Design an enzyme around this catalytic site. Structure first.
Site, PDB file in Angstrom:
ATOM      1  N   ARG A  17       2.230   1.858  16.092  1.00 37.64           N
ATOM      2  CA  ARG A  17       2.057   1.678  14.657  1.00 37.64           C
ATOM      3  C   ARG A  17       2.310   0.230  14.259  1.00 37.64           C
ATOM      4  N   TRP A  65       7.929   0.243   4.574  1.00 31.38           N
ATOM      5  CA  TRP A  65       8.509   0.966   3.449  1.00 31.38           C
ATOM      6  C   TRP A  65       9.915   1.451   3.766  1.00 31.38           C
ATOM      7  N   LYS A  76       3.845  31.222   3.010  1.00 36.71           N
ATOM      8  CA  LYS A  76       3.004  30.730   1.928  1.00 36.71           C
ATOM      9  C   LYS A  76       1.549  30.619   2.359  1.00 36.71           C
ATOM     10  N   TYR A 126       9.203  16.557   0.763  1.00 33.05           N
ATOM     11  CA  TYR A 126       9.104  17.878   0.159  1.00 33.05           C
ATOM     12  C   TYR A 126       9.098  17.817  -1.359  1.00 33.05           C
ATOM     13  N   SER A 164      14.379   5.861 -12.846  1.00 30.91           N
ATOM     14  CA  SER A 164      13.360   6.624 -13.561  1.00 30.91           C
ATOM     15  C   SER A 164      13.321   8.068 -13.077  1.00 30.91           C
ATOM     16  N   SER A 165      13.281   8.261 -11.756  1.00 29.27           N
ATOM     17  CA  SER A 165      13.212   9.607 -11.200  1.00 29.27           C
ATOM     18  C   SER A 165      14.467  10.413 -11.506  1.00 29.27           C
ATOM     19  N   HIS A 218      13.701  12.719   4.676  1.00 34.81           N
ATOM     20  CA  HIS A 218      13.057  14.036   4.954  1.00 34.81           C
ATOM     21  C   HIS A 218      13.005  14.938   3.710  1.00 34.81           C
ATOM     22  N   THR A 250       7.147  28.514   5.321  1.00 31.36           N
ATOM     23  CA  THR A 250       5.877  27.825   5.129  1.00 31.36           C
ATOM     24  C   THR A 250       4.707  28.712   5.535  1.00 31.36           C
ATOM     25  N   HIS A 295       0.826  -1.202   0.000  1.00 32.90           N
ATOM     26  CA  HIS A 295       0.000   0.000   0.000  1.00 32.90           C
ATOM     27  C   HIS A 295       0.862   1.254   0.000  1.00 32.90           C
ATOM     28  N   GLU A 330      12.529  14.042   0.873  1.00 34.51           N
ATOM     29  CA  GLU A 330      11.477  13.397   0.040  1.00 34.51           C
ATOM     30  C   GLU A 330      10.084  13.941   0.364  1.00 34.51           C
ATOM     31  N   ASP A 348       9.131  20.333 -26.988  1.00 34.78           N
ATOM     32  CA  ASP A 348       9.213  19.081 -26.244  1.00 34.78           C
ATOM     33  C   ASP A 348      10.398  19.177 -25.290  1.00 34.78           C
ATOM     34  N   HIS A 403      15.388  14.325  12.819  1.00 32.90           N
ATOM     35  CA  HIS A 403      14.205  14.422  13.717  1.00 32.90           C
ATOM     36  C   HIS A 403      13.405  13.116  13.573  1.00 32.90           C
ATOM     37  N   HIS A 404      13.714  12.293  12.561  1.00 29.64           N
ATOM     38  CA  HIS A 404      13.054  10.973  12.394  1.00 29.64           C
ATOM     39  C   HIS A 404      13.862   9.993  13.244  1.00 29.64           C
ATOM     40  N   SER A 420      -1.126  27.479  -5.961  1.00 25.53           N
ATOM     41  CA  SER A 420      -0.828  28.867  -6.304  1.00 25.53           C
ATOM     42  C   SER A 420      -1.529  29.277  -7.591  1.00 25.53           C
TER      43      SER A 420
HETATM   44  C1  HEA Z   1       3.904  15.962   2.157  1.00 18.14           C
HETATM   45  C2  HEA Z   1       4.381  15.332   3.211  1.00 18.14           C
HETATM   46  C3  HEA Z   1       4.901  16.023   4.426  1.00 18.14           C
HETATM   47  C4  HEA Z   1       5.040  17.450   4.727  1.00 18.14           C
HETATM   48  C5  HEA Z   1       4.719  18.650   3.886  1.00 18.14           C
HETATM   49  C6  HEA Z   1       5.598  17.408   6.105  1.00 18.14           C
HETATM   50  C7  HEA Z   1       5.907  18.659   6.830  1.00 18.14           C
HETATM   51  C8  HEA Z   1       6.471  18.789   8.189  1.00 18.14           C
HETATM   52  N1  HEA Z   1       6.770  17.719   8.960  1.00 18.14           N
HETATM   53 FE1  HEA Z   1       6.550  15.671   8.520  1.00 18.14          FE
HETATM   54  N2  HEA Z   1       6.293  13.638   8.034  1.00 18.14           N
HETATM   55  C9  HEA Z   1       5.826  13.097   6.891  1.00 18.14           C
HETATM   56  C10 HEA Z   1       5.389  13.883   5.737  1.00 18.14           C
HETATM   57  C11 HEA Z   1       5.380  15.346   5.645  1.00 18.14           C
HETATM   58  N3  HEA Z   1       5.801  16.173   6.623  1.00 18.14           N
HETATM   59  C12 HEA Z   1       5.766  11.618   6.847  1.00 18.14           C
HETATM   60  C13 HEA Z   1       5.303  10.722   5.739  1.00 18.14           C
HETATM   61  C14 HEA Z   1       6.284  11.242   8.154  1.00 18.14           C
HETATM   62  C15 HEA Z   1       6.453   9.873   8.749  1.00 18.14           C
HETATM   63  C16 HEA Z   1       7.446   9.006   8.004  1.00 18.14           C
HETATM   64  C17 HEA Z   1       7.558   7.745   8.813  1.00 18.14           C
HETATM   65  O1  HEA Z   1       8.105   7.820   9.925  1.00 18.14           O
HETATM   66  O2  HEA Z   1       7.082   6.686   8.363  1.00 18.14           O
HETATM   67  C18 HEA Z   1       6.539  12.554   8.782  1.00 18.14           C
HETATM   68  C19 HEA Z   1       7.057  12.634  10.139  1.00 18.14           C
HETATM   69  C20 HEA Z   1       7.453  13.887  10.764  1.00 18.14           C
HETATM   70  C21 HEA Z   1       8.391  13.893  11.900  1.00 18.14           C
HETATM   71  C22 HEA Z   1       9.016  12.714  12.561  1.00 18.14           C
HETATM   72  C23 HEA Z   1       7.997  12.232  13.565  1.00 18.14           C
HETATM   73  C24 HEA Z   1       8.439  10.910  14.100  1.00 18.14           C
HETATM   74  O3  HEA Z   1       8.708   9.984  13.312  1.00 18.14           O
HETATM   75  O4  HEA Z   1       8.501  10.807  15.334  1.00 18.14           O
HETATM   76  C25 HEA Z   1       8.560  15.305  12.229  1.00 18.14           C
HETATM   77  C26 HEA Z   1       9.449  15.793  13.306  1.00 18.14           C
HETATM   78  O5  HEA Z   1       9.529  16.979  13.540  1.00 18.14           O
HETATM   79  C27 HEA Z   1       7.751  16.083  11.271  1.00 18.14           C
HETATM   80  C28 HEA Z   1       7.686  17.536  11.250  1.00 18.14           C
HETATM   81  C29 HEA Z   1       7.241  18.284  10.084  1.00 18.14           C
HETATM   82  C30 HEA Z   1       7.300  19.753  10.118  1.00 18.14           C
HETATM   83  C31 HEA Z   1       7.790  20.644  11.229  1.00 18.14           C
HETATM   84  C32 HEA Z   1       6.765  20.116   8.808  1.00 18.14           C
HETATM   85  C33 HEA Z   1       6.591  21.497   8.314  1.00 18.14           C
HETATM   86  O6  HEA Z   1       6.891  21.561   6.917  1.00 18.14           O
HETATM   87  C34 HEA Z   1       5.158  21.933   8.566  1.00 18.14           C
HETATM   88  C35 HEA Z   1       5.077  23.449   8.642  1.00 18.14           C
HETATM   89  C36 HEA Z   1       3.628  23.865   8.731  1.00 18.14           C
HETATM   90  C37 HEA Z   1       3.198  24.878   9.498  1.00 18.14           C
HETATM   91  C38 HEA Z   1       4.121  25.710  10.328  1.00 18.14           C
HETATM   92  C39 HEA Z   1       1.731  25.204   9.512  1.00 18.14           C
HETATM   93  C40 HEA Z   1       1.440  26.190   8.397  1.00 18.14           C
HETATM   94  C41 HEA Z   1       1.996  27.535   8.795  1.00 18.14           C
HETATM   95  C42 HEA Z   1       1.264  28.468   9.420  1.00 18.14           C
HETATM   96  C43 HEA Z   1      -0.174  28.248   9.771  1.00 18.14           C
HETATM   97  C44 HEA Z   1       1.925  29.773   9.770  1.00 18.14           C
HETATM   98  C45 HEA Z   1       1.945  29.977  11.269  1.00 18.14           C
HETATM   99  C46 HEA Z   1       2.924  29.009  11.880  1.00 18.14           C
HETATM  100  C47 HEA Z   1       3.530  29.270  13.041  1.00 18.14           C
HETATM  101  C48 HEA Z   1       3.277  30.533  13.809  1.00 18.14           C
HETATM  102  C49 HEA Z   1       4.489  28.263  13.585  1.00 18.14           C
HETATM  103  N4  HEA Z   1       6.889  15.217  10.418  1.00 18.14           N
HETATM  104  C1  HEA Z   2       0.169   9.047  -1.074  1.00 21.64           C
HETATM  105  C2  HEA Z   2       0.312   8.317   0.015  1.00 21.64           C
HETATM  106  C3  HEA Z   2      -0.826   7.681   0.733  1.00 21.64           C
HETATM  107  C4  HEA Z   2      -2.264   7.707   0.442  1.00 21.64           C
HETATM  108  C5  HEA Z   2      -3.025   8.397  -0.662  1.00 21.64           C
HETATM  109  C6  HEA Z   2      -2.789   6.865   1.553  1.00 21.64           C
HETATM  110  C7  HEA Z   2      -4.232   6.608   1.665  1.00 21.64           C
HETATM  111  C8  HEA Z   2      -4.906   5.800   2.694  1.00 21.64           C
HETATM  112  N1  HEA Z   2      -4.261   5.174   3.701  1.00 21.64           N
HETATM  113 FE1  HEA Z   2      -2.192   5.145   4.104  1.00 21.64          FE
HETATM  114  N2  HEA Z   2      -0.101   5.080   4.403  1.00 21.64           N
HETATM  115  C9  HEA Z   2       0.871   5.702   3.699  1.00 21.64           C
HETATM  116  C10 HEA Z   2       0.612   6.566   2.543  1.00 21.64           C
HETATM  117  C11 HEA Z   2      -0.702   6.845   1.945  1.00 21.64           C
HETATM  118  N3  HEA Z   2      -1.874   6.379   2.426  1.00 21.64           N
HETATM  119  C12 HEA Z   2       2.264   5.464   4.154  1.00 21.64           C
HETATM  120  C13 HEA Z   2       3.551   6.002   3.595  1.00 21.64           C
HETATM  121  C14 HEA Z   2       2.080   4.571   5.296  1.00 21.64           C
HETATM  122  C15 HEA Z   2       3.122   3.962   6.198  1.00 21.64           C
HETATM  123  C16 HEA Z   2       3.257   2.474   5.905  1.00 21.64           C
HETATM  124  C17 HEA Z   2       4.183   1.829   6.906  1.00 21.64           C
HETATM  125  O1  HEA Z   2       3.950   1.985   8.120  1.00 21.64           O
HETATM  126  O2  HEA Z   2       5.145   1.152   6.491  1.00 21.64           O
HETATM  127  C18 HEA Z   2       0.608   4.403   5.329  1.00 21.64           C
HETATM  128  C19 HEA Z   2      -0.016   3.552   6.334  1.00 21.64           C
HETATM  129  C20 HEA Z   2      -1.462   3.431   6.489  1.00 21.64           C
HETATM  130  C21 HEA Z   2      -2.044   2.946   7.761  1.00 21.64           C
HETATM  131  C22 HEA Z   2      -1.301   2.526   9.002  1.00 21.64           C
HETATM  132  C23 HEA Z   2      -0.755   1.121   8.789  1.00 21.64           C
HETATM  133  C24 HEA Z   2       0.134   0.714   9.939  1.00 21.64           C
HETATM  134  O3  HEA Z   2       0.843   1.573  10.504  1.00 21.64           O
HETATM  135  O4  HEA Z   2       0.131  -0.485  10.281  1.00 21.64           O
HETATM  136  C25 HEA Z   2      -3.496   2.992   7.531  1.00 21.64           C
HETATM  137  C26 HEA Z   2      -4.491   2.628   8.570  1.00 21.64           C
HETATM  138  O5  HEA Z   2      -5.679   2.721   8.345  1.00 21.64           O
HETATM  139  C27 HEA Z   2      -3.725   3.514   6.155  1.00 21.64           C
HETATM  140  C28 HEA Z   2      -5.045   3.733   5.553  1.00 21.64           C
HETATM  141  C29 HEA Z   2      -5.264   4.570   4.371  1.00 21.64           C
HETATM  142  C30 HEA Z   2      -6.632   4.793   3.839  1.00 21.64           C
HETATM  143  C31 HEA Z   2      -7.942   4.265   4.366  1.00 21.64           C
HETATM  144  C32 HEA Z   2      -6.382   5.641   2.666  1.00 21.64           C
HETATM  145  C33 HEA Z   2      -7.350   6.204   1.695  1.00 21.64           C
HETATM  146  O6  HEA Z   2      -8.573   5.462   1.749  1.00 21.64           O
HETATM  147  C34 HEA Z   2      -7.610   7.669   2.026  1.00 21.64           C
HETATM  148  C35 HEA Z   2      -8.422   8.384   0.950  1.00 21.64           C
HETATM  149  C36 HEA Z   2      -7.616   8.495  -0.326  1.00 21.64           C
HETATM  150  C37 HEA Z   2      -7.947   7.868  -1.469  1.00 21.64           C
HETATM  151  C38 HEA Z   2      -9.166   7.003  -1.591  1.00 21.64           C
HETATM  152  C39 HEA Z   2      -7.070   8.045  -2.682  1.00 21.64           C
HETATM  153  C40 HEA Z   2      -7.812   8.867  -3.723  1.00 21.64           C
HETATM  154  C41 HEA Z   2      -6.948   9.152  -4.929  1.00 21.64           C
HETATM  155  C42 HEA Z   2      -6.618   8.211  -5.829  1.00 21.64           C
HETATM  156  C43 HEA Z   2      -7.050   6.780  -5.705  1.00 21.64           C
HETATM  157  C44 HEA Z   2      -5.757   8.594  -7.004  1.00 21.64           C
HETATM  158  C45 HEA Z   2      -6.640   8.998  -8.172  1.00 21.64           C
HETATM  159  C46 HEA Z   2      -6.934  10.477  -8.083  1.00 21.64           C
HETATM  160  C47 HEA Z   2      -6.370  11.390  -8.893  1.00 21.64           C
HETATM  161  C48 HEA Z   2      -5.389  11.016  -9.962  1.00 21.64           C
HETATM  162  C49 HEA Z   2      -6.731  12.832  -8.724  1.00 21.64           C
HETATM  163  N4  HEA Z   2      -2.449   3.649   5.390  1.00 21.64           N
HETATM  164 CU    CU Z   3      11.045  14.747   7.518  1.00 24.12          CU
END
Ligand code: HEA
Ligand code: HEA
Ligand code: CU
Ligand code: PCF
Ligand code: PCF
Ligand code: PTY
Ligand code: PTY
Ligand code: PEF
Ligand code: CA
Ligand code: ZN
Lengths: 534, 110, 98, 55, 119, 269, 36
Positions: free
Chosen positions: A438, A127, A319, A245, A157-158, A241, A316, A62, A243, A92, A290-291, A256
């Site tokens: 988890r 994963w 934006k 982004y 590919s990427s 991390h 952030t 998944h 990634e 192109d 931080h991970h 935007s």
């Molecule tokens: C698109 C995906 C995406 C994005 C954009 C982000 C964005 C951020 N993420 Fe993360 N993150 C994940 C995907 C993402 N993340 C995934 C997949 C994991 C788990 C992976 C795994 O362990 O399996 C993860 C896990 C993860 C961890 C590790 C947690 C753990 O494993 O214990 C941390 C630690 O700090 C973190 C922090 C942040 C922060 C600070 C931002 C910042 O970019 C967010 C900033 C946002 C704001 C600040 C709010 C908007 C701003 C405002 C409203 C302005 C006002 C704000 C202030 C006054 C502060 N996220």
């Molecule tokens: C893009 C990334 C992505 C997306 C879309 C999702 C979507 C969903 N995921 Fe998650 N999930 C992960 C990334 C994602 N997930 C990752 C990285 C983990 C960690 C795995 C690990 O622990 O190893 C995880 C783990 C995870 C867990 C925890 C498993 C565990 O820790 O044991 C659960 C639990 O319910 C869950 C449920 C769901 C459900 C119900 C949806 C969906 O039902 C939510 C609704 C969204 C959709 C129905 C998709 C709609 C869009 C499309 C189908 C594409 C077509 C559309 C266009 C082209 C516009 N997934």
């Molecule tokens: Cu990160």
């Protein structure tokens, strides 16, 4: 014909192929989520008999199918390949022949992944394929070897796609398009490609180290031999991390562009927007551990990583506010893309506040490896990147395909997915704060409350996806009739207050990009004589 | 019909002289690197090849002395020395890509 | 400044040679944050008569009614503009009942 | 050298680029024979591996 | 029978561009062994000509209905981008001048008439 | 130039390539290599005759890809000035990715070197390993590689100058001076006391230099195709992109060796 | 400005408090209706 699709060199056909592969993998990966929710609906093994395997394998499938086979080929390979040449003005891409191999190595990875799942062992490692559990003594089959080979194919590919986008943007622009005057989507793609270029090789090195250690006897991470299983964490997350982004920066360009067309006013402070977009990419390379807070680092490096990760909120936030300032004064058109953008602005800010809450190393000892983090990253992934993907589709599809899509049947899908995803992913934060870990198939009885509610909500989102598939069918079939009757909306910008209906019909599109001026569908050879700007 | 405008005639004679200037700079700088090659690179290789040749033969007699007497058996292996988690697939069970039976033995002390 | 604003749209409207330009200038005058002065509006009415478009003259007060933001200030613009509006013949939307 | 007479042949040929040279038939025909064995033989061992029989 | 062009005006497509090969024992030059679109560009450099046009469109005037800014294209259409008389005065508005039609630039008011040279 | 003539040519400087079967043939050759290698590692085939076949088809298909590139640049002539800048820029972005692969290998070395593991000795290199002596034989490779950068430089400028006997001689010495590096490196590998299986020390040592060793064999092949193209009058005096990217490749690959000579040989003993 | 802004501002704060209480307070309904 075989020549047109097997020997493709046209970038638009490769974009269509990328799109077509993304939906199939999207449906395949969202059924495993359905099975996971059905297994977690109630305490006790309900559907999968007692197999803890085939649960972790389903989770790995998944995650990989959702990340590496839906978002990557749709946002980068689907939209980036189709729209970057058109907005820049290039006919192109720079390397048209490696653009095809950037795609055709993806189906091979699907074969490697499926045959990995079908071997008697399977890959129940997550994963994040950590060495000691995915070593040869704990996973003794050829399964994770085949899983690793898929990662190499996606990485190549990427990488070959990223090299194509940097050269294309740098020296294939039109007669007036200085690097200072670019659309924001192109800027997002450019910065994403640069992040990919610098991040992929480290992942390749670590993954190949894991392969050689399993089969070539190298004490790379083997404890008996001086190896360190924590070096793998550094090597993997240095790509990890940055990634998180690559999957959101092209999601920023879409938002935007959306919020300044259905709100008839240009973006507030564009140069600050590109500065903030570049700063997030640059500074995300300084926060990867931080991970790895609880792995046993030094006290002083934890303070550094705590201080550096909070700076992410400064650009952030810029934006977030600049999106709320370009809609303050203008006239708002509440269409489906605008409804997706407005939902994104709220849900991504809800995810980011939880993210900054997770950024403190002293607090993360209570929120790590729980459903709290799952609820966090399902807001920025399933509500931050998926929503902008839906918004981009509803934004560009009538221009690309030439077929309208019955507005009122799409707003129903929007509301269904909204109130379905909010039901799945909001209760998770309640499960996480009580300490629900988890990656488990079955949980103590006291956690049965919110899990049932979350399981009910998955069916709503699945029904919305089925409705979306029907919308696709009704768009491809008798979609030319949708713009004859009154089922859809034709013009994305209504006339101004003192603009008559007979003057709007000589200047129909007031856009700031070449995309909406082209014929629908765009010609195979779009630009014979180059376009001139300023 | 003329398509393009009048010829610049100034870009020409500034493009056609840079080519002459470029080949002139490559003409003499090539002679400088030939002087460096013969008078620096060639003596350096000659003074290090004759040294390596003599030291190499000193190693060679040591290597052939190992085969003559096992004597007190080969030095024992530390816990990290020979790793056999999964046997090699190419040939016998325990031999690496480049193996010199003279210096690599892998004796098992059971 | 406000006086510079008024004196520069007083010149823009005097040069509008078609019905596309008149509807372009008035969409610029009412796009600014300030509500235009009554001297500005009078010149806009003259432009509509010059390009022979009745419905854009009707929309002038409709634009003002939403722009003026006050129920007495709309009457303030109403009183000073009675002579020019009645002389031209522009009807208000409420009077017209369309 | 031969570049001038090779230029006149590659241009004005109305054939695929890998078939234009008169010596191309020697490489292409043996290639597709070996290529087919390369991409079909590993696909035969897939069901044998799923059952678990090791050859 | 056919001879190399030796000039940009003698060009008659591709066959003329082909050149005389390098003599044995000498390093070939570009005027000896160029063959196609790379040669046509090379011929242009020897004169004061740029075969590929990269000049932006002028911001000198505004352009009215009775005095449009003329845009020259090899097709039946082109894409122009307006920013104002002082370049950058407003936000860019993409236009598509065609044969039998003129773009109007709803924001600024400039007018463009396509000049269809070609075919 | 008449308006009618100009319309019988491209209006842009970019190169449009015809549809080709190699992007997918290489894709299928990569699956056979990935699928056959995963089987022979655990049996299921019996001998390593299918792995060799997959590598041969992978290499042969790649040769036929490069065979097409030289045809459209030398006979059809589709590489204008703008196209030549993209190829150079694309190669510069490709060598940066190559460097960062090595950057991940230096990180693996410094992790186990600065604080050596406890299952090893308290020291580094581990107890009982006879490390390669930096002065006897590797120093010969260092002088050889530096001299390669000096003889490819005047081979490049002699080609610009216009004489082919010095240009052709510079490559011939360059090729044989790189082959000597490969054969001398082969001698040291077969005479070393420690193997890849000797704990963590052998893993990082043979992954850094082994990756460089595999890169030197691909450098000699690149040098070999420039000698064929120069001898048969392909490379001209002002247009040689397949040769400029080779000179950048050998100069960058000397800097990487100097870094591998300071930390893996000097600092690691 | 006090007279004009009052007619529009203050009613919205009451509508404001309703919607935000729905998006955030919905799980309180499920627990009360039948935590059982
Ligand atoms: C698109 C995906 C995406 C994005 C954009 C982000 C964005 C951020 N993420 Fe993360 N993150 C994940 C995907 C993402 N993340 C995934 C997949 C994991 C788990 C992976 C795994 O362990 O399996 C993860 C896990 C993860 C961890 C590790 C947690 C753990 O494993 O214990 C941390 C630690 O700090 C973190 C922090 C942040 C922060 C600070 C931002 C910042 O970019 C967010 C900033 C946002 C704001 C600040 C709010 C908007 C701003 C405002 C409203 C302005 C006002 C704000 C202030 C006054 C502060 N996220
Ligand atoms: C893009 C990334 C992505 C997306 C879309 C999702 C979507 C969903 N995921 Fe998650 N999930 C992960 C990334 C994602 N997930 C990752 C990285 C983990 C960690 C795995 C690990 O622990 O190893 C995880 C783990 C995870 C867990 C925890 C498993 C565990 O820790 O044991 C659960 C639990 O319910 C869950 C449920 C769901 C459900 C119900 C949806 C969906 O039902 C939510 C609704 C969204 C959709 C129905 C998709 C709609 C869009 C499309 C189908 C594409 C077509 C559309 C266009 C082209 C516009 N997934
Ligand atoms: Cu990160
Ligand atoms: C593409 C990437 C390269 C290919 C990677 C996968 C294939 C690796 C095969 C390695 C096979 C092997 O066992 O190699 C052994 C050799 C030397 O090992 P040795 O034979 O023990 O050498 C000493 C010889 N004595 C002292 C006994 C006389 O060791 C070597 O020469 C190893 C060279 C290969 C090193 C690969 C490093 C990969 C790093 C990451 C790459 C990411 C892409
Ligand atoms: C917001 C949109 C809807 C969100 C999803 C609501 C899901 C409600 C739900 O799951 O309620 C089920 C409980 C069952 O009762 P229980 O107390 O949990 O006992 C266990 C009984 N099982 C679960 C074995 C059947 O019964 C209830 O508690 C029903 C409460 C329903 C409250 C109204 C809907 C939510 C607010 C709107
Ligand atoms: C890793 C593969 C090598 C990547 C680095 C080279 C990419 C930059 C040079 C370049 O654009 O040429 C490519 C040819 O090399 C190749 O990509 C051919 C080698 C493929 C190796 C496959 C394993 C693609 O050139 P193009 O043929 O796409 O476009 C030709 C337009 N005139
Ligand atoms: C895996 C990694 C693969 C890396 C591939 C790197 C390719 C670099 C060169 C890219 C194209 C450069 C180019 O256009 O040069 C052409 C010749 O190059 C060529 O055709 C070079 C082909 C030889 C490269 C061999 C590399 C080892 C491959 C091993 C298997 C993979 C002719 O251009 P020109 O300007 O010189 O023509 C002058 C005519 N008047
Ligand atoms: C949210 C709470 C849950 C709501 C559940 C709704 C179920 C479906 C009802 C459909 C009714 C319908 O169709 O609504 C139609 C209405 C009225 O449209 P109209 O004025 O054109 O009149 C139509 C007849 N001529 O338009 C809208 O919806 C548009 C307004 C949407 C606002 C944003 C929605 C997305 C969420 C953003 C995040 C939250 C922002 C605020 C945060 C505090
Ligand atoms: Ca269950
Ligand atoms: Zn304009």
């Amino acid at each position: 014909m075989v020549q047109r699709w097997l020997y493709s060199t046209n970038a638009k056909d490769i974009a269509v192929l990328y799109f077509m592969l993304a939906i199939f993998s999207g449906m395949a990966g969202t059924a495993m989520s359905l099975i996971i929710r059905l297994e977690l609906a109630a305490p006790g093994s309900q559907y999968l008999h007692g197999n803890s395997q085939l649960f972790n394998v389903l989770v790995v499938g998944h995650a990989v199918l959702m990340i590496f086979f839906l978002v990557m080929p749709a946002l980068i390979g689907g939209f980036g390949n189709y729209l970057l040449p058109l907005m820049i003005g290039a006919t192109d891409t720079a390397f048209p022949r490696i653009n095809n191999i950037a795609f055709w190595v993806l189906p091979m990875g699907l074969v490697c992944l499926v045959t990995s799942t079908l071997v008697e062992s399977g890959a129940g490692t997550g994963w994040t394929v950590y060495p000691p559990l995915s070593s040869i003594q704990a996973h003794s089959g050829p399964s994770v070897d085949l899983a690793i080979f898929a990662l190499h194919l996606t990485s190549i590919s990427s990488l070959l796609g990223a090299i194509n986008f940097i050269v294309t943007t740098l020296n294939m622009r039109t007669n007036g398009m200085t690097m200072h005057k670019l659309p924001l989507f192109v800027w997002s793609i450019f910065i994403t490609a640069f992040l990919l270029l610098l991040s992929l090789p480290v992942l390749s090195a670590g993954i190949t180290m894991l392969l050689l250690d399993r089969n070539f006897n190298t004490s790379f991470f083997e404890v008996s031999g001086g190896g360190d299983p924590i070096l793998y964490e550094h090597l993997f997350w240095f790509f990890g991390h940055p990634e998180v982004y690559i999957l959101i920066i092209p999601g920023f360009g879409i938002i935007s562009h959306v919020v300044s067309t259905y709100s008839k006013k240009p973006v507030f402070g564009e140069i600050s927007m590109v500065y903030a977009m570049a700063s997030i990419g640059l500074l995300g390379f300084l926060v990867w551990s931080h991970h790895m807070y609880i792995v046993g680092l030094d006290a002083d490096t934890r303070a550094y990583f705590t201080s550096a990760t909070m700076i992410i909120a400064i650009p952030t936030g810029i934006k977030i506010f600049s999106w709320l300032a370009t809609i303050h004064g203008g006239s708002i058109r509440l269409a489906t893309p605008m409804l997706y953008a407005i939902a994104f602005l709220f849900l991504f800010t809800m995810g980011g506040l939880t993210g900054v809450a997770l950024a403190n190393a002293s607090l993360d000892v209570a929120f790590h490896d729980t459903y709290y983090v799952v609820g966090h990253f399902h807001y920025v992934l399933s509500m931050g990147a998926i929503f902008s993907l839906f918004a981009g589709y509803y934004y560009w599809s009538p221009q690309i395909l030439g077929l309208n899509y019955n507005e009122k049947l799409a707003q129903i899908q929007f509301w269904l997915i909204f109130i379905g995803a909010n039901v799945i992913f909001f209760p998770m934060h309640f499960l996480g704060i009580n300490g629900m870990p988890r990656r488990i198939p079955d949980y103590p009885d006291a956690f049965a409350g919110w899990n049932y509610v979350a399981s009910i909500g998955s069916f709503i989102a699945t029904l919305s996806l089925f409705l979306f598939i029907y919308i696709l069918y009704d768009q491809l079939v008798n979609g030319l009739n949708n713009k004859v009757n009154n089922k859809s909306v034709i013009y994305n910008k209504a006339p101004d207050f003192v603009e008559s209906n007979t003057i709007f019909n000589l200047n129909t599109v007031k856009s700031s990009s070449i995309e909406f001026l082209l014929t629908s569908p765009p010609a195979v050879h779009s630009f014979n004589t180059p376009a001139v700007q300023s | 019909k003329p398509a393009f405008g009048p010829p610049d005639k100034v870009a020409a004679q500034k493009f056609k002289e840079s080519l002459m200037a470029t080949e002139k700079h490559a003409k003499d700088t090539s002679n400088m690197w030939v002087k460096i090659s013969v008078w620096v690179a060639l003596p350096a290789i000659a003074l290090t090849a004759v040294n390596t040749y003599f030291v190499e033969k000193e190693h060679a007699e040591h290597r052939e002395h190992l085969k003559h007497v096992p004597d007190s058996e080969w030095p024992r292996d530390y816990e990290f020395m020979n790793i056999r988690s999964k046997p090699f697939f190419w040939g016998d069970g325990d031999k690496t890509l480049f193996w010199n039976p003279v210096v690599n033995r892998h004796i098992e002390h059971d | 400044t406000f006086e510079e604003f008024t004196a520069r749209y007083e010149k823009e409207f005097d040069e509008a040679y078609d019905l596309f330009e008149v509807q372009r200038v008035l969409n610029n005058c009412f796009s600014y944050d300030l509500v235009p002065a009554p001297a500005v509006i009078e010149k806009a009415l003259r432009a509509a008569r010059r390009v022979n478009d009745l419905p854009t003259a009707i929309r002038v007060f409709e634009a003002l009614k939403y722009k003026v933001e006050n129920e007495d200030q709309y009457k303030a613009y109403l009183d000073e503009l009675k002579d020019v509006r009645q002389e031209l013949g522009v009807p208000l939307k409420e009077e017209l009942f369309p | 050298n031969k570049v001038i007479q090779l230029q006149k042949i590659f241009q004005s040929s109305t054939k695929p680029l890998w078939w234009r040279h008169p010596r191309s038939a020697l490489y292409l025909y043996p290639f597709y024979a070996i290529f087919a064995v390369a991409v079909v033989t590993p696909l035969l061992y897939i069901p044998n591996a799923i059952r678990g029989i090791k050859a | 029978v056919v001879k190399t062009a030796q000039n940009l005006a003698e060009v008659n497509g591709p066959e003329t561009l082909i050149g005389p090969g390098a003599k044995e024992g000498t390093v070939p030059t570009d005027l000896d062994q160029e063959t196609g679109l790379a040669r046509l560009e090379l011929l242009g450099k020897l004169e004061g000509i740029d075969v590929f046009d990269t000049k932006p469109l002028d911001s000198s005037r505004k352009g009215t209905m009775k005095d449009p800014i003329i845009i020259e294209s090899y097709d039946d259409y082109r894409y122009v981008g307006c920013t104002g008389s002082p370049a950058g005065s407003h936000t860019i508005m993409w236009l598509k001048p065609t044969v039998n039609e003129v773009a109007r630039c709803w924001e600024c008011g400039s007018v463009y008439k396509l000049n269809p040279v070609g075919v | 130039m008449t308006h009618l003539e100009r319309s019988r040519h491209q209006q842009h400087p970019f190169h449009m390539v015809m549809p080709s079967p190699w992007p997918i043939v290489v894709s299928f050759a990569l699956l056979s290599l990935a699928l056959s290698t995963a089987l022979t590692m655990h049996g299921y085939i019996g001998n390593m005759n299918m792995v060799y076949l997959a590598l041969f088809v992978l290499l042969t298909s790649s040769i036929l890809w490069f065979r097409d590139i030289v045809a459209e640049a030398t006979y059809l002539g589709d590489h204008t000035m703008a196209v030549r800048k993209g190829i150079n820029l694309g190669f510069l972005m490709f060598v940066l990715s190559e460097v960062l692969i090595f950057a991940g290998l230096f990180w693996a070395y410094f992790h186990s070197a600065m604080s050596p593991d406890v299952t090893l000795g308290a020291c580094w290199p581990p107890v009982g390993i006879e490390a390669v002596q930096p002065t006897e034989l590797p120093l010969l490779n260092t002088i050889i590689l530096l001299s390669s950068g000096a003889t490819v430089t005047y081979s490049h400028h002699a080609l610009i100058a216009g004489n082919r006997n010095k240009a052709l001689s510079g490559l011939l010495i360059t090729f044989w001076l790189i082959v000597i590096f490969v054969t001398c490196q082969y001698i040291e590998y077969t005479n070393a006391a420690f193997t890849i299986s000797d704990g963590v020390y052998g893993s990082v040592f043979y992954a850094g230099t082994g990756l460089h060793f595999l890169h030197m064999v691909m450098l000699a092949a690149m040098l070999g195709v420039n000698y064929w193209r120069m001898r048969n009058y392909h490379l001209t005096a002002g247009h040689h992109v397949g040769y400029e990217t080779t000179i950048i490749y050998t100069h960058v690959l000397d800097v990487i060796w100097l870094f591998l000579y300071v930390v893996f040989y000097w600092w690691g003993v | 400005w006090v007279i004009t802004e009052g007619r529009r501002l203050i009613p919205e704060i009451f509508q404001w408090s309703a919607v935000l209480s729905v998006c955030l307070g919905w799980p309180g309904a499920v627990y009360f209706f039948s935590k059982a």
